[PDB]
Amino acid sequence: MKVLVVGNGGREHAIAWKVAQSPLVKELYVAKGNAGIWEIAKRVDISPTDVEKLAEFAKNEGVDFTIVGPEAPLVEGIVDEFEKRGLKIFGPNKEAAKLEGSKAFAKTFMKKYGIPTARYEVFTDFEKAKEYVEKVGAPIVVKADGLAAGKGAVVCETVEKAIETLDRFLNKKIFGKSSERVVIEEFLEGEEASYIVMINGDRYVPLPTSQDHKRLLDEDKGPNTGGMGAYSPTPVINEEVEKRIREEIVERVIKGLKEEGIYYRGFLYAGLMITKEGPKVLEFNVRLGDPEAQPILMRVKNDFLETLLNFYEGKDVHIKEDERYALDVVLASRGYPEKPETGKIIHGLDYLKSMEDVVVFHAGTKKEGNFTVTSGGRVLNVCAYGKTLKEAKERAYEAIRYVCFEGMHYRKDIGDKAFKYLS
Ligand SMILES: Nc1ncnc2c1ncn2[C@@H]1O[C@H](COP(=O)(O)OP(=O)(O)OP(=O)(O)O)[C@@H](O)[C@H]1O
């Protein structure tokens, strides 16, 4: 069968990599993808957000199954475009994608269905929002309503930073309609963690747990980014935390969707903050997280293509998790998360291909002749398996010693928050 993966980053390389292990796929396509994915998939020169054009391609090319990686295409209704042409695609339709597409929608939904989350208030008026934050004081979190390419959610340590943020969002409208409405919520403290499940109507199946590191620099400093590294599983989500997540979050989302009459099929990644009060939703992501997908998929033993195909049509499935830990360190471009420098030659990729228990997922890489060059903010995902987390971390960092590109930056503390939970 023909399978199409939509997206150009590390999450998509992980997806394609897993799909390519299945005896079912005969032709694998990626739109657009990157240098790393092109070693195992045919390049489709269509941007992931050109949803109508992608649907037309899949139809004409006869794609049997499509898996969507990033949020933009989903929020834009790529699934609806595919359904319109009678195509099978894994991901939520435009209405269901609102759980990620609109913070206001998500927060209102969670309040209505009793889902644990940060207390909040919604605003469309700068003066009103300003007066509000001055009254509540800091720390506080200010978020744009719609997608803002990783710049919509800002933690403000001071009231001044909050008003400055509101100014850019509401007065300047830096993100257009996306920033014309904002959500201001309480700053939550605790340990961050990621819980991802696959949902199809009333049924859901959990995927490996994980913990990401959002800040650019070691000891959680510097600006927020799309994610600088993640590992699986994370002890932050023990047996009982997982029980609370499934019952107070996942199952309540399912109940809410049912009451709203909204059909949901696809991945649901809940960005969490595990507080002393219990797990709370920072935000919903209607797709796999990046880089969370990398270590997660590294630990899914079974044929993931078969699993997705069966789950897609309502068949029961059972995820078999690798007993080994999986850790991923992101190598980013100088400038990231602000304008990244690009066009730098990446050396050492061949060395890593021969390293055992090492896996590299490309993110933002392209070709320049026979050379592989940087083309985006996040460039490489240097991953490694390990019987223990310590082993996984050390192997990943050992691998980093052999890869290189000008201006490369990466955190050295990926996974450090987990050790206080282990022995
Ligand atoms: N209520 C909160 N309390 C504490 N930290 C928060 C809160 N909300 C968000 N954060 C921090 O911001 C991060 C989210 O960054 P993220 O970019 O994923 O926001 P987003 O919802 O995806 O919208 P955008 O991508 O445009 O910024 C969280 O992982 C967390 O570290």
UniProtKB/Swiss-Prot annotation:
InterPro entries: ATP-grasp, ATP_grasp_subdomain_1, PreATP-grasp_dom_sf, PRibGlycinamid_synth_ATP-grasp, PRibGlycinamide_synth, PRibGlycinamide_synth_C-dom, PRibGlycinamide_synth_C_sf, PRibGlycinamide_synth_CS
Residues noted as binding Mg(2+) in the record, renumbered to the chain: E283, N285
Known EC number: 6.3.4.13
Names of required cofactors: Mg(2+); Mn(2+)
Catalytic activity, reaction form: 5-phospho-beta-D-ribosylamine + glycine + ATP = N(1)-(5-phospho-beta-D-ribosyl)glycinamide + ADP + phosphate + H(+)
Gene3D superfamilies reported for this sequence: 3.40.50.20, ATP-grasp fold, A domain, ATP-grasp fold, B domain, Phosphoribosylglycinamide synthetase, C-terminal domain
Cofactor: binding details: Binds 1 Mg(2+) or Mn(2+) ion per subunit.
Disulfide bonds: none
Entry binding sites for ATP: 133-194
Bilayer-crossing regions: none
Family: Belongs to the GARS family.
Protein name per the record: Phosphoribosylamine--glycine ligase
Organism field: Aquifex aeolicus (strain VF5)
Lineage: Bacteria, Pseudomonadati, Aquificota, Aquificia, Aquificales
